Amino acid sequence: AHAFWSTQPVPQTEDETEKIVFAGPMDEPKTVADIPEEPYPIASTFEWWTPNMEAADDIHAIYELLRDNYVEDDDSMFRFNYSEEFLQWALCPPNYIPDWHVAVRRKADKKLLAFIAGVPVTLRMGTPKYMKVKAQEKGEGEEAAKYDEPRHICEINFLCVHKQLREKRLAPILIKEATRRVNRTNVWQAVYTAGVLLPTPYASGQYFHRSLNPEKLVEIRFSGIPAQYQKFQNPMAMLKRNYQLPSAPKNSGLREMKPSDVPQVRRILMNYLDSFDVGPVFSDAEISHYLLPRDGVVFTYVVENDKKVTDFFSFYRIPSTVIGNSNYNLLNAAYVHYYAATSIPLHQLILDLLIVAHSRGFDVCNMVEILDNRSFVEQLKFGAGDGHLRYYFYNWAYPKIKPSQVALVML
Numbered sequence: 291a292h293a294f295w296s297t298q299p300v301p302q303t304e305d306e307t308e309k310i311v312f313a314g315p316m317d318e319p320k321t322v323a324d325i326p327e328e329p330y331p332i333a334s335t336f337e338w339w340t341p342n343m344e345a346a347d348d349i350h351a352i353y354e355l356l357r358d359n360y361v362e363d364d365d366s367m368f369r370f371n372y373s374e375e376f377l378q379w380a381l382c383p384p385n386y387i388p389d390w391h392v393a394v395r396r397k398a399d400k401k402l403l404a405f406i407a408g409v410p411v412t413l414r415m416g417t418p419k420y421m422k423v424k425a426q427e428k429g430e431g432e433e434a435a436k437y438d439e440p441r442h443i444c445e446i447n448f449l450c451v452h453k454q455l456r457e458k459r460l461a462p463i464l465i466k467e468a469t470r471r472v473n474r475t476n477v478w479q480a481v482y483t484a485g486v487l488l489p490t491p492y493a494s495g496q497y498f499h500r501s502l503n504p505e506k507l508v509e510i511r512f513s514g515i516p517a518q519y520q521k522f523q524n525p526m527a528m529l530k531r532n533y534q535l536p537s538a539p540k541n542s543g544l545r546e547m548k549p550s551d552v553p554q555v556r557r558i559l560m561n562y563l564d565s566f567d568v569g570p571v572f573s574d575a576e577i578s579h580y581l582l583p584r585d586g587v588v589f590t591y592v593v594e595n596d597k598k599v600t601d602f603f604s605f606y607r608i609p610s611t612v613i614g615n616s617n618y619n620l621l622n623a624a625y626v627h628y629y630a631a632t633s634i635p636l637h638q639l640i641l642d643l644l645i646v647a648h649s650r651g652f653d654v655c656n657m658v659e660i661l662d663n664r665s666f667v668e669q670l671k672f673g674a675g676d677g678h679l680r681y682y683f684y685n686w687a688y689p690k691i692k693p694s695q696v697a698l699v700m701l
């Protein structure tokens with residue numbers, strides 16, 4: 291059923307995954323010495339290319355490939371339009387490996403045809419808490435705890451094959467070449483997400499959306515006017531009333547994050563993330579990179595209420611091309627990122643996220659039900675969407691867990 295994925299070190303069925311109790315590798319160990327030096331074979335009219343993601347014209351090439359060929363919804367109404375500044379941010383975190391940015395281009399004219407990117411991440415991915423409880427009942431705590439140390443692994447994103455080269459088995463070649471380059475750096479696990487079902491997720495979370503500009507969202511068919519709003523004399527007026535927000539944040543001491551906040555944000559964030567079964571571990575430099583504000587890309591606010599920072603939230607921006615509607619060019623979406631609340635209820639913290647996003651002209655706020663995102667869905671008028679983000683590991687056996695046990699935000 292899966293001519294490529296049946297050859298890979300991933301659990302092959304939900305039934306296999308349901309049987310996994312402890313975290314650990316799928317493969318017996320390999321060595322860097324075992325891995326081919328030479329890039330994976332490709333047709334001789336193509337070549338491998340490692341873009342320099344600190345070079346504006348190489349970023350622009352990838353930007354255009356993804357603008358025209360990256361993820362669409364199933365109804366080909368919207369297509370992500372990640373910006374050039376977003377790609378630089380996403381692809382170049384501290385200690386990133388340039389060789390893990392993998393492209394295919396035509397040899398003759400250097401046209402970019404396909405892309406996949408890996409970045410390093412330090413992830414806790416040991417056996418989940420409940421399975422450790424049972425393991426300790428049975429005298430198996432040691433085996434269950436064996437892989438508890440945060441691991442330096444690869445996070446994969448931005449897999450894209452030009453629309454004219456689809457269904458030619460080029461994505462398996464991309465994946466094999468990325469695997470080779472990662473393996474050559476002595477890393478043997480990856481984490482990735484997808485909206486499609488592949489063998490085999492360890493978690494799956496529904497999408498959620500919070501309308502900020504419902505008139506536009508209805509016009510572009512992101513949203514509809516539900517049937518119950520039809521029993522109003524003015525359905526759209528009542529939809530705008532449902533979703534209206536303050537212009538000014540409510541929390542005293544809210545302000546944008548600055549570099550001197552990095553140590554305190556790291557502390558409260560890590561204290562929080564550490565309570566989840568799967569979660570990243572961030573250095574000061576990584577907190578700085580992934581959370582300090584960057585115009586048009588990432589937006590991060592702290593609560594510093596006559597006291598050291600006690601709370602913070604972040605969101606990032608991905609516009610989507612409105613490919614199915616001529617009246618608008620872009621859908622300006624905010625995505626809930628990391629946050630931590632120690633002094634105020636989480637719903638009060640995230641209400642200010644929505645207030646700030648609306649004031650900055652975002653049309654919708656999106657998230658997946660990871661972290662404690664379910665805890666403010668109803669009060670803040672998030673609605674469940676039509677899809678799921680599935681979380682996967684490469685070469686890591688892992689029990690099925692709930693999405694509320696996942697603390698890794700993907701970009």
Ligand SMILES: CCCCCCCCCCCCCC(=O)SCCNC(=O)CCNC(=O)[C@H](O)C(C)(C)COP(=O)(O)OP(=O)(O)OC[C@H]1O[C@@H](n2cnc3c(N)ncnc32)[C@H](O)[C@@H]1OP(=O)(O)O
Nearest residue numbers: 292293294295361448449450451456457458459460461478
């Ligand atoms: C240790 C280090 C390891 C590093 C690697 C870790 C693994 C990383 C894995 C990648 C994580 C990516 C995370 C993200 O970026 S998810 C975002 C993926 N990108 C898009 O959706 C953008 C638009 N679509 C395209 O560009 C193409 O349709 C793609 C490139 C998706 C497939 O190209 P194409 O449509 O021309 O098909 P093919 O004939 O070449 O290939 C068909 C095979 O590809 C399998 N397929 C289809 N969709 C996906 C998918 N999203 N992840 C993994 N595999 C996928 C499919 O089941 C089939 O295999 P099998 O069913 O026959 O077995």
Ligand SMILES: COc1cccc(CC(=N)NC(=O)c2ccccc2OC2CCNCC2)c1
Nearest residue numbers: 361362363368369370485497610656657658701
């Ligand atoms: C808004 O316009 C578009 C354009 C293309 C596809 C889709 C469907 C979708 N794949 N949504 C998410 O992945 C997603 C949903 C909710 C929260 C976060 C989401 O995605 C993130 C960014 C993509 N990488 C994973 C996180 C929507």
